[PDB]
Structure formats: structure tokens, C-alpha cells
């Protein structure tokens, strides 16, 4: 067996950024040059590693996160970024080792009328820690008096929709993102080349 990268990159649905999906890759072999020799990605930055050397290396586990964001927003899927995505939805650590792979998904995730399936956290009291996943849907308490599940002044619903049609600008269109993380522990490495 080799690694099911096709069931993460080519999967039918993708997750919202705030509820990003994660897949744990183990006991398989992975050809990575088949990913960088696809020519089908708009973004493919690797950190702490070089994509070509990648098929030469071993890791104990590899993690594939995947989610949809907006065009101008792929800038935030980097170490050391700020903004509502990197602060409040998905944060990479300053010493990330792995690859951020993005591509244009305007063809599939942006329908006429609105694709309101894709959401993002717009309100949060404090920045995420790296690889944190906030799923609460509490009303957001911007004031000092609690909300008690009612929207209103100082009392905001925390997730907001993207609204993606197939007719847009450039960095206001939907992009599917896959973040690969490479972990090497004092344990039997199970993903090799």
C-alpha cells in the first residue's frame, strides 16, 4: 500500500477553515514528486524541507490538514502570519516543517446564488495556538454582560459565511488548501519514500 493522498487532495467535499479536517498518514509509502510534478497547484511552499528531497526522507507520521479559504487569505497559511484566518481559524507554528499546497477551487466550491456552506470564525477573544481547532458556536461576548445565546448588541454569532459564486475578482474566489506536516519522533518511522 501507498499513501492515500488522492482521498485528501481529490476528495469531494472540503471542510470549512474553522473546522479544518485532519488526516493521519501511517504505514505507507508516499511519492511526493508526483504532487509537485502535477503543475496543477497555485501555491506549493515547503518549510524546513525541500520538496525534491522529500521522497528520500522518512517520518514517523505525516498529517494532512485540508480546508477552503479565500484567495487573498492563502498569504496567512504561513509561519508568522497574522489576520483573521491565521489568528482565529488555522495557525502554523513559527518552526513549521512541511508544505502548504493551495489551488483554485472556483470551479467546484462556488455556485450561483451563493455557496454558503463554507464558514470562518470572525470573532475570537484571543489568538489560536498552533494546530488548535476551535469549533464552539457560542454567541461571542464583545461586552461585559453575557449573551445567553441571543444575538444582539455586543452579542455576535462567531462564524460568518464566504458566499462563493463562480463569478468573482481574483483573491475573493475559493481556494482549497492542504497543509502537510512532517513529524519525526523517537518512534518507528512509518512513512517513507
Amino acid at each position: 500500500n501507498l499513501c492515500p493522498f488522492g482521498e485528501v487532495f481529490n476528495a469531494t467535499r472540503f471542510a470549512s477553515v474553522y473546522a479544518w479536517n485532519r488526516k493521519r498518514i501511517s504505514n505507507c509509502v508516499a511519492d511526493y514528486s508526483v504532487l509537485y510534478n502535477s503543475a496543477s497547484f497555485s501555491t506549493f511552499k515547503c518549510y524546513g524541507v525541500s520538496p525534491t528531497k522529500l521522497n528520500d526522507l522518512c517520518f514517523t507520521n505525516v498529517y494532512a490538514d485540508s480546508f477552503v479559504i479565500r484567495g487573498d487569505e492563502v498569504r496567512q497559511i504561513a509561519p508568522g502570519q497574522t489576520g483573521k484566518i491565521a489568528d482565529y481559524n488555522y495557525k502554523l507554528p513559527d518552526d513549521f516543517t512541511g508544505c502548504v499546497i493551495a489551488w483554485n477551487s472556483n470551479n467546484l466550491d462556488s455556485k450561483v446564488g451563493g455557496n454558503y456552506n463554507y464558514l470562518y470564525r470572525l470573532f475570537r477573544k484571543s489568538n489560536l495556538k498552533p494546530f488548535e481547532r476551535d469549533i464552539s458556536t457560542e454567541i461571542y461576548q464583545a461586552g461585559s454582560t453575557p449573551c445567553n445565546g441571543v444575538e444582539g448588541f455586543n452579542c455576535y454569532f462567531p462564524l460568518q459565511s464566504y458566499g462563493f459564486q463562480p463569478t468573482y475578482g481574483v483573491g475573493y474566489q475559493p481556494y482549497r488548501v492542504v497543509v502537510l506536516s512532517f513529524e519525526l519522533l523517537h518512534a518507528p518511522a512509518t512513512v517513507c519514500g
Epitope: 487573498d72 483573521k84 464583545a142
Partner: antibody
């Protein structure tokens, strides 16, 4: 009520510094997108800098590097440090709560900054 | 970047008129669009949020409509206190908001 009280404007020579203060009552600065917005004489509203609830900052291209937004949670007060002022920083300066899709609903009172030699 | 525009720069109206301000975003912004009132020497006042929701404490003669590139603010029966300048603001790219250039409503004569 909910109110954003501003202070600290005045006359200042070009190259000088000025510290604007916005004292919040009825919302928690630490919990909000807090923006500074300014309006030159006879022009419109221009966004300056923002303080995310999480602590991130962003700034207008034209003040990037000279101004720094900040806060003190103890005093529930928003700040703007204005250094290396030029003549075109002259405007009425507003602090405001940006509630995003729900609108910029709370606005300060204005404080006027004249930079002149 | 999204640039905002405003239909007529200034328009004249009589008390009791039905007034329509338009606003246009340089790119589809769905319905992330807010309307503001400003009288000389004072701070802006939020009138409409999310294109058509009425802000608390704002008279119901005010109303918004639109989605995409085009938006409209209506005042059903202009009151004497409504003579002022009206701005639109987009919040698609929050918190980096851009404002419209304004529409002044003065007194017809």
C-alpha cells in the same frame, strides 16, 4: 451608555509626536476589532490602524511605520502613538468599534490633530 | 482591493420626499455593506448593517437593499433631520474597510 471618549489632539510641529486616547465604556476593547479612522478637512472617512481582539495590528500604507496602536486592559483604553507627523496627518481622528458584518456601530467623538510649521 | 462608488454626488429633496441613494462596489461583495449618516462636525452614525438590517434606534423610514455589486438606501418620507451626507462602507475585507465617497442631500428650492 456605551461611549468612546477621545482625547489628546492638538497642534504639533511636523516631525513631532502625539498620543491619542480612547476610553471605552459599555464594550470591552480587549474583545473587539478596535479601529482608528480619520477624516481630513472636506474629505471623507479614511481607515488608519486596527487592533484585533487577539492582539494583531494592521496599519494604513501611509502611516505604516510611524504610528502604533495599542491598549491598556486595566483602563479599558485604546491608544494611538503618532510619531513623525506630517502636514497631511491633519484630520479629525475617530476611534470606533468595528463589528464587521454588524457594522461600525460605536464611534468616538472626534479629536482634531493639526500638524503645521 | 475594493473601491466603492456613490450614484449622485449630491441630490436635492423636499421634506416628505422618497429618496434613493445608490452605492456600487468594484467587485461582488455579497451583502457585506453598511450605510452611514454624517452631519457637519459630528461623528458618523450607523444606519443599515448587512445591506438591509435596520440598526437599533434608527427610524424605520430608513431601509437598505442589494447584494453583489449594487446597493440602495431609501428614506421613505424625508424628515427635516435627514438633510446630511450619507456614506456606504463595505465589510467584506474586515477589518480593513473602505468607505464610499459620500452623497450629500440638501434642501430643494
Amino acid at each position: 451608555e456605551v461611549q468612546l471618549v477621545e482625547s489628546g489632539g492638538g497642534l504639533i510641529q511636523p516631525g513631532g509626536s502625539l498620543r491619542l486616547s480612547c476610553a471605552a465604556s459599555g464594550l470591552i476593547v480587549s474583545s473587539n476589532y478596535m479601529s482608528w479612522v480619520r477624516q481630513a478637512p472636506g474629505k471623507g472617512l479614511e481607515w488608519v490602524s486596527v487592533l484585533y481582539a487577539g492582539g494583531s495590528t494592521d496599519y494604513a500604507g501611509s502611516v505604516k511605520g510611524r504610528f502604533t496602536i495599542s491598549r491598556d486592559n486595566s483602563k479599558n483604553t485604546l491608544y494611538l502613538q503618532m510619531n513623525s507627523l506630517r502636514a497631511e496627518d491633519t484630520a479629525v481622528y475617530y476611534c470606533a468599534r468595528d463589528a464587521a458584518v454588524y457594522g461600525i456601530d460605536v464611534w468616538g467623538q472626534g479629536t482634531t490633530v493639526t500638524v503645521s510649521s | 482591493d475594493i473601491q466603492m462608488t456613490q450614484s449622485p454626488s449630491s441630490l436635492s429633496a423636499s421634506v416628505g420626499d422618497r429618496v434613493t441613494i445608490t452605492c456600487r462596489a468594484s467587485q461582488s461583495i455579497s451583502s457585506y455593506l453598511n450605510w452611514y449618516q454624517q452631519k457637519p462636525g459630528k461623528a458618523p452614525k450607523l444606519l443599515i448593517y448587512a445591506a438591509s438590517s435596520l440598526q437599533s434606534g434608527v427610524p424605520s423610514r430608513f431601509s437598505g437593499s442589494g447584494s453583489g455589486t449594487d446597493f440602495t438606501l431609501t428614506i421613505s418620507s424625508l424628515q427635516p433631520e435627514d438633510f446630511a451626507t450619507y456614506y456606504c462602507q463595505q465589510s467584506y475585507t474586515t477589518p480593513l474597510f473602505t468607505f464610499g465617497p459620500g452623497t450629500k442631500v440638501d434642501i430643494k428650492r
